[PDB]
């Protein structure tokens, strides 16, 4: 237990001067015609690259991936265009090699300005990175154990120190996540930040801990929900999910609202464990309902008691429930939010999800530690442009999830302390 955090990071890594550092970063960026159209992921690693740079480092070899070429070189997923971006961000020349491992790679690296930055090609072009892959005719194909081993040592031969700045992909145990067997393994500033806020919230958080979950499906969250019930104090279940709970628990006339057949079967277990673990469940007691799934459709409000008429569905929290939010949230000390409270992507049904954000942002300033990790949830924080108003918005893909699901994250375990 308590594996998260308490690891090793760039910060406080003595003897970096004149050393060759290998950095695993997240460069999976959206691109159109060799034109990167969102350089945040690139700018984000600058702090790490900069620090290493002004510390000595004979070389700065960067390795990463983009897309899912599946083990075969696919020109639609080459990191070349990213190397160009870095030239302008660093203000100096950057070396691009169309390879990750090999003799030439090692040679070309050593033959490059003394404080140069070098960026190899997509690691995912080697089936040995993920382990499996597919072929030309699109058929599943598995790597060769000897090959994977060869690939992992070839990477380990690239440098002396290894810094991993790629959270969000640490839940998978790929060659670049657990293969670089070097002695010094530390987190990048990005990584370090993530590992910091999560443990600060899953290991020993300032109570009460609030978990805000949301989303249509309840069936694909059983694991998440349970693993949390035994560590949180309050929990708000919203968005679609609520309907399934409200029918199983209160015999509410859900109308046409979304109903999760599979999940309807785990509602008993949850409510039970929740009571056993002494966790308070908070569910909407009124909802805005539409006579058709689409923004701008006749809409009215009803209570859970009144119930939703036939051929009518609910699409957002009613005002009584959105007022009921203030107390639960503003009184929390730490908050893990994952899930919009309604169909936010449609203006008319985003009030419940927008008002929650303000309350989350506001409790942050009141001093509470707030973490978001949804992505679909973040996309809301992003559209609102409030990333900074929140303690930490995890840029973690599936990774964030599994850690909130209780899973282990190889990528992290393979780090020093
Ligand atoms: N009441 C609702 N009805 C339909 N979709 C919803 C509702 N509340 C939220 N959603 C969105 O529908 C999607 C359901 O996916 P998931 O959360 O993965 O089950 C998420 O991207 C939610 O933002």
Q: Could you tell me the two tokens for 69?
A: 């070429």
Identify whether the C-beta of residue 68 lies closer than 8 Å to the C-beta of residue 124: yes
CA gap 21, 43 in Å, rounded:
19
**Which residue, 282, 288, 279, is CA-closest to 354?**
288
The helix-helix angle for 267-276 and 241-250 (nearest 10°) equals: 80
3-class SS of residue 239: strand
DSSP state of 241: H
Residue 218 alpha carbon, nearest atom of ligand 1: 19
C-alpha 130 – ligand 1 centre gap (Å): 30
Contacts of 64 (CB under 8 A, 6+ apart): 24, 25, 26, 27, 28, 79, 122, 123, 166
Same fold across 5-190 and 197-405: yes
Query: Among 212, 215, 263, 284, which residue has the most ligand 1 atoms within 8 Å of its CB, making it the best to mutate?
Result: 215
CA gap 411, 179 in Å, rounded:
10
Contacts of 297 (CB under 8 A, 6+ apart): 290, 291
Contacts of 14 (CB under 8 A, 6+ apart): none
Q: Answer yes or no: is 67 a known binding residue.
A: yes
Q: Could you tell me the two tokens for 139?
A: 């058929």
C-alpha 319 – ligand 1 centre gap (Å): 19
Q: E-strand spans in 291-367?
A: 299-303, 313-317, 334-338
Query: Among 222, 257, 343, 375, which residue has the most ligand 1 atoms within 8 Å of its CB, making it the best to mutate?
Result: 343
Phi-psi region at 225: left, alpha or beta (left = phi > 0; alpha = psi -120 to 50): alpha
Residue nearest (by alpha carbon) to ligand 1 atom 20: 215
Q: How many CB atoms are located within 10 Å of the residue 219 CB? A: 15
CA gap 398, 25 in Å, rounded:
16
Query: Which residue blocks in 266-339 are alpha helix, DSSP H?
Result: 267-276, 319-330
226 has catalytic annotation: no
CA gap 125, 67 in Å, rounded:
10
3-class SS of residue 271: helix
Q: In a 10 Å sphere around its CB, with 0-12 CB exposed, 13-18 middle and 19+ buried, how is residue 197 labelled? A: buried
Identify whether the C-beta of residue 195 lies closer than 8 Å to the C-beta of residue 4: yes
CA gap 114, 95 in Å, rounded:
12
234 has catalytic annotation: no
3-class SS of residue 27: coil
CA gap 288, 301 in Å, rounded:
4
Burial 4-40 (b: 16+ CB within 10 A, else e): bbebbbbeebeebeebbbbbbbbbbbebeeeebeeee
* Chain position carrying tokens 């730490």: 334
What CA–CA distances, in Å, run from 354 to 97, 211, 235, 339, 380? 45, 17, 18, 12, 8
Contacts of 220 (CB under 8 A, 6+ apart): none
Residue 258 alpha carbon, nearest atom of ligand 1: 3
DSSP state of 394: -
Domain 5-190, CATH homologous superfamily name and number: Phosphoglycerate kinase, N-terminal domain (3.40.50.1260)
**Resolution of the structure in the document, Å:** 3.0
Contacts of 231 (CB under 8 A, 6+ apart): 202, 209
Q: What is the largest CA-CA distance in the chain?
A: 75
Which entry of 375, 396, 397, 411 is annotated as an active-site residue?
A: 375
Q: Could you tell me the two tokens for 18?
A: 């004149």
Residue 316 alpha carbon, nearest atom of ligand 1: 1
3-class SS of residue 84: helix
Beta strands 313-317 and 299-303 are unpaired
Q: Answer yes or no: is 62 a known binding residue.
A: no
Residue 220 alpha carbon, nearest atom of ligand 1: 19
Query: Among 213, 220, 240, 337, which residue has the most ligand 1 atoms within 8 Å of its CB, making it the best to mutate?
Result: 240
179 has catalytic annotation: no
Which entry of 231, 398, 406, 407 is annotated as an active-site residue?
A: 398
First and final C-alpha spacing in the chain: 15
Domain 197-405, CATH homologous superfamily name and number: Phosphoglycerate kinase, N-terminal domain (3.40.50.1260)
Phi-psi region at 13: left, alpha or beta (left = phi > 0; alpha = psi -120 to 50): beta
Residue nearest (by alpha carbon) to ligand 1 atom 14: 216
Q: Could you tell me if the CB of 217 is within 6 A of ligand 1?
A: yes
CA gap 373, 397 in Å, rounded:
8
**Method for structure elucidation:** X-ray
217 has catalytic annotation: yes
Q: Answer yes or no: is 40 a known binding residue.
A: yes
CA gap 116, 92 in Å, rounded:
9
Residue nearest (by alpha carbon) to ligand 1 atom 22: 215
Query: Which residue blocks in 185-257 are alpha helix, DSSP H?
Result: 189-202, 222-229, 241-250
CA gap 362, 354 in Å, rounded:
12
Q: Could you tell me the two tokens for 4?
A: 């998260």
Q: Answer yes or no: is 374 a known binding residue.
A: no
Q: Answer yes or no: is 165 a known binding residue.
A: no
Taking only Cα atoms into account, the Rg of the chain, rounded to an integer number of angstroms, comes to 24
CA gap 94, 383 in Å, rounded:
33
Residue 407: phi, psi to the nearest 5? -65, 170
* Chain position carrying tokens 């309050």: 234
CA gap 191, 193 in Å, rounded:
5
CA gap 37, 195 in Å, rounded:
28
Q: Answer yes or no: is 44 a known binding residue.
A: no
Identify whether the C-beta of residue 171 lies closer than 8 Å to the C-beta of residue 178: no
What are the sequence ranges of the domains in the chain? 5-190, 197-405
């Amino acid at each position: 237990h308590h594996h998260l955090g308490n690891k090793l990071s760039i910060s406080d890594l003595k003897d970096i001067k004149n050393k060759k550092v290998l950095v695993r970063v997240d460069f999976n960026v959206p691109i159109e015609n060799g034109i990167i159209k969102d350089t945040n992921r690139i700018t984000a690693t600058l702090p790490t690259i900069n620090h290493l740079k002004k510390e000595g480092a004979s070389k700065i070899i960067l390795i990463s991936h983009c897309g899912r070429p599946d083990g075969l070189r696919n020109e639609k997923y080459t990191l070349k265009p990213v190397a160009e971006t870095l030239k302008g961000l660093l203000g100096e020349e950057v070396l691009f090699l169309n390879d990750c491992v090999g003799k030439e790679v090692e040679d070309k690296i050593n033959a490059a300005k003394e404080n140069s930055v070098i960026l190899l090609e997509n690691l995912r072009f080697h089936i040995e990175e993920e382990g499996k892959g597919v072929d030309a005719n699109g058929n599943k194909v598995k790597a060769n154990k000897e090959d994977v081993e060869k690939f992992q040592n070839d990477l380990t031969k690239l440098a002396d120190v290894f810094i991993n700045d790629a959270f969000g992909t640490a839940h998978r145990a790929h060659s670049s996540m657990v293969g670089v067997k070097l002695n010094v393994k530390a987190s990048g500033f990005l990584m370090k930040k993530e590992l910091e806020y999560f443990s600060k919230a899953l290991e020993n958080p300032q109570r009460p801990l609030l978990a805000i979950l949301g989303g249509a499906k309840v069936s694909d969250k059983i694991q998440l929900i349970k693993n949390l019930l035994d560590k949180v104090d309050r929990m708000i279940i919203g968005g679609g999910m609520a309907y399934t709970f409200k029918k199983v628990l209160n015999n509410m006339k859900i109308g046409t609202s979304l109903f999760d057949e599979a999940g309807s079967k785990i509602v008993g277990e949850i409510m039970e464990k929740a009571k056993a673990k002494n966790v308070q469940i908070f569910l909407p007691v009124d909802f805005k309902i539409a006579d058709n799934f689409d923004n701008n459709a006749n809409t009215k409000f009803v209570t859970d008691e009144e119930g939703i008429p036939d051929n009518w569905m609910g699409l957002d929290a009613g005002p009584k429930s959105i007022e009921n939010y203030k107390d639960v949230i503003l009184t929390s000390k730490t908050v893990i939010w994952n899930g919009p409270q309604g169909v936010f992507e449609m203006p008319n049904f985003a009030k419940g999800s927008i008002e929650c954000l303000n309350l989350v942002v506001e409790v942050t300033k009141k001093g509470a530690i707030t973490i978001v990790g949804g992505g679909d949830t973040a996309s809301l924080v992003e559209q609102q442009n409030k990333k900074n108003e929140i303690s930490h918005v995890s840029t973690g893909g599936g990774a964030s999830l599994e850690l909130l699901e209780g899973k282990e994250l190889p990528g992290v375990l393979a780090l020093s302390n």
